[PDB]
Design a protein around this ligand. Structure first.
Ligand SMILES: [Zn+2]
Ligand SMILES: [Zn+2]
Lengths: 97, 148, 257, 115, 64, 144
């Protein structure tokens, strides 16, 4: 339940999309199903990755050693480009995928 | 004016948890006009504060009261008129967090603004409309004047 | 023009120590003054020993080290004497050094104490301060010490034998009004001799606008200079360093332009 | 084996400048004064005297290494004031204070000695 | 071996006080009283005489 | 062990903990002395944290100048209570035991071995991973 809530993009809730994305972006997400299909595929790939992880780490220990610190890189990007967490974003969800 | 927030606060607690630091006390204050909750770290050595003290708190983005940005460097020799002349305790800090009761759909009704004045921390809670001038990573001035 | 206007109060003046207070100075000036008392007040001390005979139980440079530490009268002759490095003569001359002689033979059964009274100078103005006397070495029957020494000008920044002070007590803010020192338990700390507080309170109330302005001194003299001469010599020597510096700074400013 | 002569801390070797002035490129109206064969004695008083000048924005000194005998004094003044001018005025203020201190100490000795 | 000329800490002259210090102890003075009588107030100087060992006396026993 | 092999040690580590306490305030003269020992200093004196009644810089302010670049790090002080993260003051630490370096500035927290020692995720580790060896080299010397 938590995994689906946190990682599955919700293109159905119009009010939620307005808060996070800009007006020109929510329309594209809501209008065409090609983008929505890509978002659905993204979660399916993530769900497949979830099961692969469960095999690699049966004990459930999520602490791993990996090359690049993504969370700090995101933090650097937020400071470098003065991202405002309160305002809606202009980053199209498909550009992320 | 370049004033982000202004109100009068009354000190309710000086150090509820305890005296964590000798020269700094954590004021827990509440306003009566906007009903904003204030937690403030104050240099109690140079600016003593007592329970029940009333003071005027102003959060401004500039001290020149002319709209000119200070640029964030020490300029003691500046003779330009300063809003700090009317206040007794002036602190310069950076807002590092803006929390709120926002949900996925609904906006925020209550906002919490956290400011670090060189390590002295301030949290300003209350209605979102009263804290709209606060933007994270922005430099603000805290101006305090005890009221008799 | 932002010079201070210091005032001086001399509380105690003896032959060994001068106790005084300076008010209306910066802490840097007060500290640089004590720091010149120790390191940059010239006196005359033995810095050149030539031992012709030493049958004592102390080796040659043991004796020389002791002779260097023996204080010599320097009250007025030190200003006249030139630094041997600055002097245009050979190794030594009367204008940059004072010649000393020591020739002691022990032939009695009783132990012979070689003291500073056995040092004979070629100039009456520079003599060992003791003339009890400082013990250089004890001689057994049949032992002798025959040496000649040259005393030259110098200051404590080079060697401690040219330091004219026997302890420079320096103090400010005795009641800790400025809180430059934080006492975990102020009640546990003895009151300063200059403390103006009552017995009941241990600390003066904190002064947010206070600054170190009054400074207490106790300049004890080894004997080479009168304690008041050490202070005056320090004040003129410190002024000399600054005036010498400004002359160099003037050339550098002129040279750049 | 490697002991430097004691005099090396206050005597300049031939070809050594007592003081050199280098402009600070980081900020305007800032100069670095490198004084040779000086220690915290002159560095502290000059620094403290400069801080008394209202036209001096930054005054600070340092001994880069205790085994070396250099002090670097960094002075920053207002655009209408030169760091070199601040440095000269600081020394004159120090010299005036010391000369006044000498006169008032001599009077104190005479008063104490007289009675 | 022999009493140091100066106190190591402050540079006060202590090499003229050993014989006087010994004489005072001969006069039934306590060590603290004898040091006070000699004017050694700072405990750095009292350390010099209170802890001195005069081995030069032993060395004088050996014939040159 | 994919972590720094050298960090801050006996005097500097004990003093930096005292230095970054919430109640450390430095006068104008004291600050100017410290900036003389900051090789990477840009020459601009920062606006003091307290302007009135007297200009006072906090220790965190001066340490922020030492921190290279604009690195971002989150650490906890050794004396950080476990239940504070679950309390109402998670982001405004009563004890100053939450270390947050944001945009190269120490906005809160007391620095200790946990944030300056030889541990993975240390502020010194971030400097190396972000700024490189040369800037991290200066970071070491400037702290001392
Ligand atoms: Zn000569
Ligand atoms: Zn002593």
């Amino acid at each position: 339940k938590a995994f689906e809530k946190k990682f599955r993009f919700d293109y159905t809730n119009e009010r939620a999309l307005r808060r996070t994305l800009q007006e020109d972006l929510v329309k594209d997400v809501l209008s065409n199903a090609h983008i929505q299909n890509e978002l659905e595929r993204e979660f399916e790939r993530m769900r497949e990755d979830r099961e692969v992880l469960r095999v690699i780490f049966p004990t459930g220990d999520s602490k791993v050693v990996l090359p690049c610190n993504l969370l700090r890189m995101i933090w650097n990007a937020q400071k470098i480009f003065h991202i405002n967490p309160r305002l809606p974003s202009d980053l199209h969800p498909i550009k992320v995928v | 004016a370049g004033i982000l927030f202004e109100d009068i606060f009354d000190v309710k607690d000086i150090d509820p948890e305890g005296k964590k630091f000798d020269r700094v006390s954590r004021l827990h204050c509440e306003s009566e006009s906007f009903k904003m909750d204030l937690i403030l770290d104050v240099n109690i050595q140079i600016y003593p504060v007592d329970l029940g003290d009333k003071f005027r708190l102003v959060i401004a983005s500039t001290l020149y009261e002319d709209g000119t940005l200070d640029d964030g460097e020490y300029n003691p020799t500046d003779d330009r008129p300063s809003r700090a002349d009317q206040f007794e305790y002036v602190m310069y800090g950076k807002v590092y967090r803006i929390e709120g009761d926002e949900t996925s759909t609904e906006a925020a009704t209550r906002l919490s603004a956290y400011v670090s004045y060189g390590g002295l921390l301030m949290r300003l809670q209350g209605d979102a409309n009263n804290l709209h001038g606060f933007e994270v990573d922005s430099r603000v001035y805290l101006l305090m004047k005890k009221l008799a | 023009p932002y010079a201070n206007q210091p005032t001086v109060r001399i509380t105690e003046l003896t032959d060994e120590n001068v106790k005084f207070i300076i008010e209306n100075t910066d802490l840097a000036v007060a500290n640089s003054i004590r720091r010149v008392f120790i390191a940059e007040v010239p006196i005359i001390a033995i810095d050149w020993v030539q031992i012709d005979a030493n049958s004592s139980v102390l080796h040659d440079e043991f004796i020389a080290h002791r002779l260097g530490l023996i204080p010599l009268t320097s009250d007025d002759i030190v200003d006249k004497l030139q630094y041997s490095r600055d002097c245009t003569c050979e190794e030594f001359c009367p204008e940059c050094s004072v010649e000393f002689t020591l020739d002691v033979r022990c032939n009695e059964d009783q132990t012979r104490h070689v003291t500073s009274r056995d040092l004979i100078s070629n100039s009456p103005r520079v003599i060992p301060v003791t003339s009890d006397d400082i013990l250089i070495v004890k001689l057994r029957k049949g032992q002798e010490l025959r040496l000649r020494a040259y005393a030259k000008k110098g200051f404590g920044k080079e060697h401690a034998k040219w330091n004219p002070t026997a302890g420079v007590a320096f103090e400010y803010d005795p009641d800790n009004a400025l809180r430059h020192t934080v006492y975990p338990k102020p009640e546990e700390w003895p009151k300063s001799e200059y403390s103006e507080l009552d017995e009941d309170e241990s600390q003066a109330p904190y002064d947010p606008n206070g600054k170190p302005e009054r400074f207490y001194y106790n300049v004890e003299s080894c004997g080479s200079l009168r304690p008041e001469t050490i202070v005056l010599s320090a004040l003129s020597g410190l002024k000399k360093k600054l005036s010498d510096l400004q002359t160099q700074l003037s050339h550098e400013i002129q040279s750049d332009v | 084996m490697n002991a430097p002569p004691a005099f090396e801390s206050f005597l300049l070797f031939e070809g050594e400048k007592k003081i050199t002035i280098n402009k600070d490129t980081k900020v305007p109206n800032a100069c670095l004064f490198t004084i040779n064969k000086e220690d915290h004695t002159l560095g502290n008083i000059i620094k403290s005297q400069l801080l008394k000048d209202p036209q001096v924005l930054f005054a600070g000194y340092k001994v880069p290494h205790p085994l070396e005998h250099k002090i670097i004094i960094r002075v920053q003044t207002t655009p209408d004031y030169s760091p070199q001018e601040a440095f000269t005025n600081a020394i004159t203020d120090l010299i005036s204070e010391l000369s006044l201190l000498e006169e008032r100490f001599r009077v104190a000795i005479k008063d104490k000695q007289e009675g | 071996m022999i009493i140091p000329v100066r106190c190591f800490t402050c540079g006060k002259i202590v090499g003229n006080k050993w014989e006087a210090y010994l004489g005072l102890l001969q006069a039934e003075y306590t060590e603290g009283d004898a040091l006070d009588a000699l004017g050694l107030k700072r405990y750095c100087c009292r350390r010099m005489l209170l802890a001195h060992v005069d081995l030069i006396e032993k060395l004088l026993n050996y014939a040159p | 062990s994919n972590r720094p092999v050298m960090g801050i040690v006996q005097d500097t580590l004990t003093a930096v903990r005292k230095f970054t306490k919430r109640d450390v305030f430095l006068e104008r003269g004291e600050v100017m002395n410290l900036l003389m020992f900051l090789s990477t200093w840009d020459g601009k004196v920062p606006q003091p944290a307290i302007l009135k009644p007297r200009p006072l810089w906090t220790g965190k302010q001066i340490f922020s100048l030492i921190i290279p670049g604009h690195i971002n790090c989150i650490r906890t002080h050794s004396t950080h209570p476990d239940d504070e993260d679950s309390g109402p003051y998670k982001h405004i630490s009563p004890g100053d035991t939450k270390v947050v370096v944001e945009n190269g500035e120490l906005i809160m927290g007391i620095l200790c071995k946990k944030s300056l020692g030889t541990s993975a995720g240390s502020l010194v580790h971030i400097s190396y991973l972000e700024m490189g060896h040369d800037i991290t080299r200066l970071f070491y010397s400037n702290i001392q």
